[PDB]
Design a binder for this molecule. Structure first.
Ligand SMILES: CCCCCCCCCCCCCCCCCC(=O)OC[C@H](COP(=O)([O-])OCC(O)COP(=O)([O-])OC[C@@H](COC(=O)CCCCCCCCCCCCCCCCC)OC(=O)CCCCCCCCCCCCCCCCC)OC(=O)CCCCCCCCCCCCCCCCC
Ligand SMILES: CCCCCCCCCCCCCCCCCC(=O)OC[C@H](COP(=O)([O-])OCC(O)COP(=O)([O-])OC[C@@H](COC(=O)CCCCCCCCCCCCCCCCC)OC(=O)CCCCCCCCCCCCCCCCC)OC(=O)CCCCCCCCCCCCCCCCC
Ligand SMILES: CCCCCCCCCCCCCCCCCC(=O)OC[C@H](COP(=O)([O-])OCC(O)COP(=O)([O-])OC[C@@H](COC(=O)CCCCCCCCCCCCCCCCC)OC(=O)CCCCCCCCCCCCCCCCC)OC(=O)CCCCCCCCCCCCCCCCC
Ligand SMILES: CCCCCCCCCCCCCCCCC[C@@H](O)O[C@H](CO[C@H](O)CCCCCCCCCCCCCCC)COP(=O)(O)OCC[N+](C)(C)C
Ligand SMILES: CCCCCCCC/C=C\CCCCCCCC(=O)OC[C@H](COP(=O)(O)OCCN)OC(=O)CCCCCCC/C=C\CCCCCCCC
Ligand SMILES: CCCCCCCC/C=C\CCCCCCCC(=O)OC[C@H](COP(=O)(O)OCCN)OC(=O)CCCCCCC/C=C\CCCCCCCC
Ligand SMILES: CCCCCCCCCCCCCCCCCC(=O)OC[C@H](COP(=O)(O)OCCN)OC(=O)CCCCCCCCCCCCCCCCC
Ligand SMILES: CCCCCCCCCCCCCCCCCC(=O)OC[C@H](COP(=O)(O)OCCN)OC(=O)CCCCCCCCCCCCCCCCC
Ligand SMILES: Nc1ncnc2c1ncn2[C@@H]1O[C@H](COP(=O)(O)OP(=O)(O)O)[C@@H](O)[C@H]1O
Lengths: 347, 321, 121, 459, 56, 98, 49
């Protein structure tokens, strides 16, 4: 792929997402979704191999089905109201269709399998862009249409996402599948808080995006896609492993790190609405995510795995490409708990 | 620009524009103690190409830091002399040496490709990663290494060498084994005097039966005897009058050259799969020894920081760099 | 969304004109000092990742890190203070304009209030 | 409190900027200076607490714990410099940094005036401890020990976070002064039962309660010496401090909800003493003794009388000092013979006399020997339990008998008898080890001399 | 020489200056809580001729 | 609502159920995906023509445009899969697991 | 000379160094001016000084 073509495809993905986030018309929002998917497929297929082709095929099928359901919901809403503006939807059936379509686009359970499948299939840069941006857009649509969300359906899908992400991440050994299940669990948390505070949804989105960017860029720096490949990083550049360890501790929600702020604020907000069982279950279930984060931390930094002999040549050579904003993402993902009241600025 | 990358590519730097149709990759091959080195020297100097001597141990030492070789405990952890003295060691010296030499040849091939794609000048290598496997088969058929070692070699070679361009010219110097042994005896080095005749025969069999048939399909192959290789004028004349348009180099484009140059200029991405988590007893190093040797390497003079930031080797202006 | 759609809200405005009447954060604000600390930590991590001397190398780069963090932190603190002041303004206005919903209650002393006593034995 | 907090955050850069051979010296000297500075918190008032600012306050309960933490840091530094001789400079500095961060978090925890900030800090204490255990433990089981410790603590504490945010929503504040002055009775309802359960269970897991204590032998046995010292001396006291703080708003539900916990504490005190009688590992014996003592502290807090709280505070301070000293002695023995088996090394009285004296004094303080503050606290708890009921005296007497039995069993096994013949690398005791023992033991005797400093606000 | 001693032993002032700064910040925090100074019913009194505040 | 809207919505539901139930071929599921957009086009134009929403008459054409863009994307992915495996069977898309 | 090949960071990139220092100085002076103007506007609006 030509660099000009790649940058124009990235620009087109961002253009689709921005069209979704600036449009006041359902047709224009659907157009933005379609443009985003159309420019996103080749990004997945950039490094051509059967795994990448299969991941792109599964992603295309899922997103096409979601777009069909979304346009059906738009049409049904138009039939009963004659309105194209994105507001509270006027038909419960259309609202259910839209909720299911946006949940499928996000990867909320039980629409999650494509997330680990595609994330394993595609490279690290593709997975980073996929997770971050393709969560960025449908959450914007949901925040706009939150006041008509069915709380029962939204919270059911959110709790399912949390449980399934925890269990899948428990089982996986592949780093990309681990990141995908982490994404599923975090999306569950965000959509669980969504029907109450879109501000808390946005706060969790920002913190999750920062932590995910830091983790993916650390993986790209170490060029490790498996647990054992990451187990050799301590013998080449031990600083990256320590930074990954503190980022993993933050992503598990351990105080006083940045990952505790979204969980804390969401639990507080849901408690304000007389919800106790759901916050307690969500808090207890995240211990699975913390467990497999800790298991990954044991293999990479807290213990020394055996290495090989060509690692001496690797010692002799130095990393060339410089990650952009990696130190900033590492600092923002661990040390911004004292800056919590800025969510009012986020309001 | 100021460094090759996508920005330079979109600015307009093109490898096809840089090339001058004399940019060829020539690899000279032969059995142990042949005239291949002198032939490569003569070919490189007559055609004006850059000569790359055979990538033995400490080649990476020569290309990094100061050119002086490092300690064997820190660079290679293997000994050709020990391989000659005790080929069937119980410490995996044979396959450690073989894998390290393959990695060194991979690094040298990456360096040669980078030089050709950045300067347009041809390169004459004294051996390549495509000829390296003959010593692997020679070790395997003599019982020096194991089938697991051979399988690991094959996996690494696949995932690494599948990404590079084969040489334009493969020049093989054919010398009979009795002549090889006579030259070895004349040289008088004891370790290579301990080389057996079957080990030399296995290398020639691997060259004749696999390497030469494989290279013939890809591009031109030139074979010379001792007398023919001694007269390099006719060899250079033969090279200058080679007609071939069946190689992948004519099929290469500007985007393919951009991808290849981005790959070869990144030395850590070249050696990415040389260290895969396959735990052979020959090549695996324990945690404690790994930590100690890494500490020693970091304690080496100009190795603690990046090249521009080592004060103990006379680097100034660090606080503004 | 609580304060989204508030009357008179100009879209895409980080700081409106009505925020100018609030006290700006001091330059020695502890929150600003913490933002500068975050910038310094980012510079140290950058040196560590690039394998330069962590404390000595790249003084200009570390200074730029600290300065950028302080700049964005000052503006972020201004916006946060404006939003909290706006929240208090709206709350007080609603309380004043709904007296039947927020009635004053007669204050009784603990000499009149009867509280059950639970012995600890 | 900033006059104590800031010097720790300055210990950090001093550690990272000192030379390679001076880190231990600088850290020890300045830790001792910070402890001396923190000795000024003991001047407390008889009416109320020391309210420095809106964020931090000190009380007759917080002051001895803060002084104990600040005094415990340099001893941990001494032990760590004992067992980390061959480490690299960067990793030595990282270990010192973990200790400094733990001390800072503990100080802020003990002085936090709100329950949510207290929760944040007392949960932040987990990360340095987990790193220390799972990184500088000697054996394989350190990973499992860290997992058990972390997950026990977090599964206990998350419902506490939910309860705290709920209480803030209901009452308007989590400030301790406000919740003490504006406290209202807790009616007998399922919701109040489960709120009480959330808070008490978090702190019980921190204590630990019997039946929720396996993580304690796991972590204490497998942690390094400094980690073992901090785990027993201070980190076990966060649960008791929290229970003595939260129980303000949990009345009168504590009269009826405390029965299962009291029964568990008493019976498990007996059971853990009996377990101590039959331990083939010295560190495990010390850990189970800690479990029994903290079970007695739980009994005191649950019966919740002015005589019980004073005993609880005194016993917490005494147990911290004694358990730290016992762990240090066992660690010196381990550094001799590289094994934790109790019966491996014998005749250590004839091989090392002054260490035998230190063992004798530590064991005499471990059992309640008058007039030690250990006995003061235990006797106050026993008297309060006697006023509570008159069979608690039977249980306490059984526990005291078993405590003396296993303490003297450990002493006789390790020190008396004849030495192992084939162990010939037991070098004479170091001045550093002797100084560590002296600094462990002398403050305990001085506290015995002046006992009103560790009897808490109820004095 | 003398320069090396200062070059090595300059970290011994960090904790003392931190203690001094902590005392200063404690004074700063105390001076913000002076809204009931000489206003409590228990300790209210008339100022001496040569004093402005009861405490600082 | 008249029965024509019922029939069009039922057609959309049938086409959606067809896509969610693969048999062997990816091409058949692509055809099922194309039919859903045909039903959407018909429903949208029936609604717009009945309410005389004059400016909305351009929406179905944009719908068709993005429909055939999706069809093009599916065909490209299908040719890549067929080159990889020799058949357009969805059973061969099993390298990645959940 | 030590390295066999001239390091990329052998000499400071004076353009980048000057731009970095200039950006830091510009941001600091702009922040000071902005704070002064904010204080003045706050006082003017609230009728303090
Ligand atoms: C229009 C005007 C500007 C044009 C700029 C680009 C054109 C000029 C340079 C050029 O030719 O670039 C070619 C170059 C492609 O050359 P290549 O040889 O094919 O390199 C392949 C890989 O990029 C090589 O892999 P890599 O390791 O170099 O990866 C590069 C890239 C790969 O990642 C991406 O491209 C993803 C970009 C989005 C990341 C997620 C952002 C999330 C924001 C959340 C919301 C925040 C509010 O970025 C990262 O890996 C880290 C991204 C960190 C983003 C942090 C954002 C914080 C806010 O293009 C790019 O690198 C992408 C340019 C994207 C431009 C659009 C704006 C963004
Ligand atoms: C200072 C206290 C900080 C407290 C926390 C604050 C937040 C974080 C700090 C910001 C980041 C700092 C830099 C990080 C990288 C450091 C790399 C390094 O080697 O550093 C050594 C470096 C000197 O060595 P060098 O010659 O430059 O290079 C040697 C090589 O780097 C030698 O490298 P190597 O090749 O030997 O590398 C191997 C090593 C590599 O290991 C590292 O690089 C460790 C550090 C990176 C890990 C992550 C750091 C934290 C990032 C944020 C995460 C949250 C932090 C808070 C967490 C709380 C809960 C735990 O890996 C291992 O040893 C592996 C085994 C251990 C793994 C398990 C433990 C992981 C612990 C993770 C948490 C650590 C928290 C504290 C970190 C303190 C770092 C100084 O010293 C420092 O960087 C010291 C810190 C800066 C001091 C500035 C002093 C200025 C002048 C005095 C100012 C006085 C106050 C001002 C007011 C006015 C007074 C008058
Ligand atoms: C199974 C046999 C059994 O019930 O044993 C109870 C027995 C408690 O001792 P107890 O002296 O028989 O109880 C006194 C009265 O019978 C019961 O006390 P009460 O009648 O005065 O009313 C107070 C009662 C109020 O009753 C309720 O609230 C009943 C409604 C269900 C509450 C569930 C709370 C669960 C809290 C987390 C437990 C994690 C384990 O409080 C509780 O139920 C406290 C629940 C928490 C107990 C201790 C949790 C740690 C256990 C450690 C070992 C785990 C293995 O043992 C256990 O709870 C643990 C071992 C059995 C499992
Ligand atoms: C007249 C000539 C002068 C004009 C001056 C310019 C006027 C302002 C121009 C603003 C830039 C131009 C537009 C560029 C995009 C605008 C983005 C921003 O300005 O908009 C604001 C948005 O501001 C950002 O949200 C605040 C960024 C806060 C970043 C931190 C988040 C808090 C994290 C908590 C932890 C903090 C850790 C420390 C961080 C370093 C509000 O816009 P709004 O239309 O209403 O948003 C609608 C969506 N809502 C309602 C749901 C919010
Ligand atoms: C609907 C709500 C319920 C949903 C789920 C709620 C979760 C409740 C809290 C979960 C705690 C998370 C810890 C469990 C993680 C899973 C452990 C597991 O998979 O068991 C296997 C695992 C071994 O396999 P691996 O270590 O993964 O590697 C094997 C290498 N061949 O077993 C272990 O040894 C790990 C044990 C972890 C620590 C032990 C658990 C700690 C105590 C748990 C209860 C907490 C007590 C509360 C006080
Ligand atoms: C499997 C069975 C698990 C049994 C253990 C329970 C843990 C599962 C947590 C799921 C919640 C179950 C209890 C729910 C209690 C609850 O929500 O109500 C408490 C009450 C609700 O009141 P309102 O909603 O306002 O009603 C208004 C009346 N007009 O709110 C509160 O008081 C906050 C309480 C926080 C929830 C506590 C849930 C856990 C109970 C404590 C157990 C602690 C376990 C600690 C683990 C360590 C050992 C494993
Ligand atoms: C050089 C290496 C890089 C690190 C540079 C650190 C300092 C950067 C700032 C330089 C000074 C800028 C300035 O003018 O600051 C003044 C300003 C307060 O001024 P003002 O409030 O107007 O005056 C008092 C009025 N009552 O001050 C502020 O607003 C404070 C904002 C900055 C907060 C900094 C927090 C700590 C940053 C790290 C310090 C590291 C010190 C040691 C460095 C060692 C290097 C070898
Ligand atoms: C709004 C701007 C956002 C960032 C835009 C730029 C991103 C790409 C560039 C930064 C890449 C990572 C930083 C390290 C680079 C190391 C290489 C180097 O030598 O860089 C030199 C550079 C100074 O170069 P110079 O051109 O002078 O920069 C000023 C602008 N002309 O040195 C530096 O640039 C180092 C200092 C960078 C400043 C920290 C990063 C931005 C922080 C902004 C404050 C907000 C923090 C939170 C950010 C997320 C939320 C907004
Ligand atoms: N893959 C390999 N395994 C073992 N030994 C090798 C390998 N490659 C080269 N060598 C050794 O390196 C030396 C290369 O020099 P040689 O082929 O004899 O040419 P010359 O006689 O010109 O030096 C030989 O002694 C050979 O044994």
């Amino acid at each position: 792929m030509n660099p000009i073509i790649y940058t124009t495809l990235i620009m087109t993905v961002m253009s689709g997402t921005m069209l979704v986030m600036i449009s006041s018309h359902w047709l224009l929002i659907w157009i933005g979704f379609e443009m985003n998917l159309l420019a996103m497929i080749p990004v997945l297929m950039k490094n051509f191999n059967p795994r990448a082709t299969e991941a792109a095929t599964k992603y295309f099928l899922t997103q096409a089905t979601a777009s069909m359901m979304l346009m059906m919901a738009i049409i049904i809403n138009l039939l009963y109201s004659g309105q194209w503006t994105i507001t509270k939807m006027f038909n419960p059936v259309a609202m259910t269709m839209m909720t299911m379509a946006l949940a499928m686009k996000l990867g909320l359970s039980p629409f999650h399998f494509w997330v680990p499948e595609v994330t394993q299939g595609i490279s690290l840069q593709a997975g980073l862009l996929l997770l971050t941006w393709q969560k960025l857009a449908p959450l914007s649509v949901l925040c706009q249409i939150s006041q008509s969300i069915n709380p029962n359906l939204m919270l059911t899908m959110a709790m399912l996402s949390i449980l399934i992400g925890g269990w899948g991440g428990l089982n996986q050994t592949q780093l990309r599948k681990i990141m995908a299940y982490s994404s599923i669990a975090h999306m569950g948390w965000m959509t669980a808080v969504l029907p109450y505070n879109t501000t808390m949804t946005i706060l969790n989105l920002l913190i999750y995006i920062t932590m995910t960017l830091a983790m993916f860029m650390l993986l790209i720096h170490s060029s490790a896609t498996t647990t054992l490949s990451l187990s050799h990083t301590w013998n080449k550049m031990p600083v990256i492993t320590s930074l990954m360890m503190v980022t993993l501790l933050s992503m598990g929600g351990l105080p006083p790190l940045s990952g505790f702020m979204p969980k804390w604020m969401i639990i507080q907000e849901m408690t304000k609405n007389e919800s106790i069982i759901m916050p307690t279950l969500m808090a207890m279930t995240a211990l699975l995510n913390l467990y497999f984060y800790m298991r990954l931390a044991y293999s990479s930094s807290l213990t020394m795995f055996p290495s090989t002999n060509n690692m001496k040549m690797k010692w002799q050579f130095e990393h060339t490409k410089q990650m952009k904003l990696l130190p900033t993402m590492i600092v923002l993902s661990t040390l911004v708990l004292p800056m919590t009241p800025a969510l009012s600025s986020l309001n | 620009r100021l460094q090759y990358g996508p920005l330079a590519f979109v600015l307009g730097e093109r490898t096809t524009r840089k090339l001058t149709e004399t940019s060829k990759v020539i690899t000279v091959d032969g059995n142990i103690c042949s005239g291949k080195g002198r032939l490569a020297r003569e070919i490189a100097e007559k055609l004006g190409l850059r000569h790359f001597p055979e990538a033995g141990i400490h080649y990476a030492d020569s290309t990094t830091g100061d050119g002086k070789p490092l300690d064997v405990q820190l660079s290679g952890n293997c000994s050709l002399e020990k391989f000659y003295d005790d080929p069937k060691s119980n410490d995996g010296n044979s396959y450690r040496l073989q894998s390290w030499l393959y990695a060194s040849r991979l690094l040298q091939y990456a360096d040669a490709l980078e030089h050709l794609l950045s300067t347009g000048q041809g390169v004459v290598l004294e051996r390549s990663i495509y000829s390296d496997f003959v010593f692997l088969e020679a070790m395997y058929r003599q019982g020096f290494i194991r089938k697991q070692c051979v399988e690991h070699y094959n996996e690494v070679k696949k995932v690494t060498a599948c990404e590079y361009l084969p040489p334009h010219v493969v020049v093989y110097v054919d010398v009979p084994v009795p002549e090889i042994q006579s030259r070895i005896q004349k040289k008088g080095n004891p370790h290579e005097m301990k080389i057996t005749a079957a080990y030399l025969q296995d290398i020639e069999n691997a060259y004749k039966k696999t390497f030469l048939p494989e290279m013939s399909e890809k591009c031109e192959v030139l074979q010379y005897s001792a007398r023919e290789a001694e007269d390099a004028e006719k060899v250079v004349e033969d090279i200058e009058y080679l007609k071939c348009d069946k190689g992948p180099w004519p099929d290469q484009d500007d985007r393919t050259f951009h991808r290849l140059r981005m790959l070869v200029q990144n030395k850590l991405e070249v050696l990415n799969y040389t260290t895969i988590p396959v735990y052979l007893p020959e090549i695996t190093i324990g945690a404690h020894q790994s930590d100690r040797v890494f500490q020693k390497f970091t304690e080496l003079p100009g190795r603690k920081y990046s090249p521009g930031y080592n004060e103990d080797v006379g680097d100034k202006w660090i606080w503004l760099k | 969304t609580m304060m989204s759609g508030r009357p008179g809200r100009v879209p895409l405005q980080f700081l409106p004109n009505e925020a100018r009447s609030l006290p700006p954060p001091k330059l020695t604000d502890p929150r600003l000092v913490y933002m500068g600390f975050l910038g310094y930590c980012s510079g140290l991590i950058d040196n560590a990742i690039r394998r330069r001397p962590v404390v000595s190398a790249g003084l200009h780069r570390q200074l730029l890190y600290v300065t950028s963090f302080v700049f964005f932190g000052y503006y972020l603190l201004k916006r946060q203070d404006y939003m909290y002041a706006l929240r208090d303004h709206d709350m007080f206005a609603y309380v004043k304009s709904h007296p039947e919903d927020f009635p004053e209650k007669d204050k009784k002393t603990y000499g009149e209030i009867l509280e059950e006593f639970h012995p600890v034995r | 409190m900033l006059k104590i907090i800031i010097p720790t955050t300055m210990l950090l850069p001093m550690t990272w900027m000192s030379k390679h051979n001076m880190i231990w010296i600088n850290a020890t000297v300045h830790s001792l200076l910070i402890s001396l500075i923190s000795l000024s918190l003991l001047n407390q008032l008889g009416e109320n607490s020391l309210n420095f600012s809106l964020t931090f306050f000190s009380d007759s309960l917080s002051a001895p714990l803060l002084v104990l933490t600040t005094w415990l840091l340099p001893l941990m530094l001494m032990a760590s410099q004992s067992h980390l001789s061959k480490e690299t400079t960067t990793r030595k500095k990282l270990y010192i940094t973990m200790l400094i961060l733990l001390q800072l978090f503990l100080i802020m925890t003990f002085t936090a005036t709100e329950l949510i900030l207290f929760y944040i800090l007392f949960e932040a204490t987990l990360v340095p401890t987990l790193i220390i255990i799972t990184r500088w433990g000697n054996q394989t089981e350190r990973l499992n020990a860290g997992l058990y410790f972390l997950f026990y603590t977090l599964a206990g504490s998350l419902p506490l976070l939910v309860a705290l945010v709920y209480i803030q929503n209901t009452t308007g504040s989590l400030n301790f002064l406000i919740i003490h002055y504006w406290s209202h009775p807790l009616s007998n309802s399922w919701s109040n039962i489960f709120m009480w359960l959330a808070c008490i269970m978090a702190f019980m897991v921190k204590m630990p309660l019997y039946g929720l204590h396996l993580w304690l032998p796991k972590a204490h046995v497998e942690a390094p010496i400094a980690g073992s010292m901090v785990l027993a001396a201070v980190l076990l006291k966060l649960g008791g401090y929290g229970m003595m703080r939260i129980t303000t708003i949990l009345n009168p539900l504590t009269n009826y909800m405390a029965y299962p916990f009291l029964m568990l504490s008493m019976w498990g005190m007996i059971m853990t003493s009996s377990i101590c009688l039959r331990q083939t590992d010295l560190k495990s014996l010390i850990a189970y003794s800690s479990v029994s003592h903290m079970a007695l502290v739980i009994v005191a807090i649950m019966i919740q009388t002015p005589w019980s709280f004073m005993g609880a505070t005194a016993l917490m301070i005494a147990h911290g000092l004694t358990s730290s000293m016992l762990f240090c002695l066992a660690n010196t023995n381990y550094e001799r013979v590289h094994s934790r088996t109790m019966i491996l090394a014998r005749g250590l009285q004839t091989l090392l006399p002054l260490m035998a004296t230190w063992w004798l004094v530590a064991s005499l303080t471990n059992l309640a020997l008058p007039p030690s503050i250990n006995l003061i606290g235990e006797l106050f708890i026993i008297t309060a339990s006697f006023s509570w009921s008159n069979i608690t005296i039977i249980l306490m007497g059984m526990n005291m008998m078993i405590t003396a039995l296993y303490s003297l069993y450990m002493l006789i096994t390790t020190q008396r008898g004849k030495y192992t013949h084939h162990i010939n690398n037991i070098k004479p005791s170091f001045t550093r080890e002797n100084a560590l023992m002296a600094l462990h033991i002398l403050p305990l005797l001085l506290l015995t001399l002046n006992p009103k400093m560790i009897l808490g606000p109820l004095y | 020489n003398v320069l090396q001693i200062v070059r090595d032993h300059w970290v011994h002032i960090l904790v003392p200056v931190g203690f001094v700064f902590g005392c200063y910040l404690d004074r700063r925090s105390d001076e913000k809580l002076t809204a009931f100074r000489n206003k409590s019913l228990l300790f209210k009194r008339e100022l001496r001729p040569n004093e402005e505040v009861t405490w600082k | 609502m008249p029965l024509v809207y019922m029939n069009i919505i039922m057609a959309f539901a049938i086409a959606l159920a067809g896509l969610l139930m693969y048999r062997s071929h990816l091409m058949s599921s692509l055809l099922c995906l194309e039919g859903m957009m045909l039903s959407l086009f018909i429903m949208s134009t029936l609604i717009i023509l009945n309410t005389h929403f004059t400016l909305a008459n351009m929406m179905p054409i944009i719908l068709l445009v993005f429909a055939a863009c999706e069809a093009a994307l599916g065909l490209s992915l299908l040719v890549m899969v067929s080159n990889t495996y020799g058949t357009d069977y969805v059973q061969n898309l099993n390298l990645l697991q959940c | 000379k030590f390295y066999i090949r001239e390091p990329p960071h052998g000499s400071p990139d004076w353009l980048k160094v000057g731009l970095t220092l200039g950006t830091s100085v510009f941001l600091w002076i702009y922040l000071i001016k902005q704070h002064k103007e904010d204080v003045l506007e706050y006082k003017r609006r609230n009728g303090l000084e």
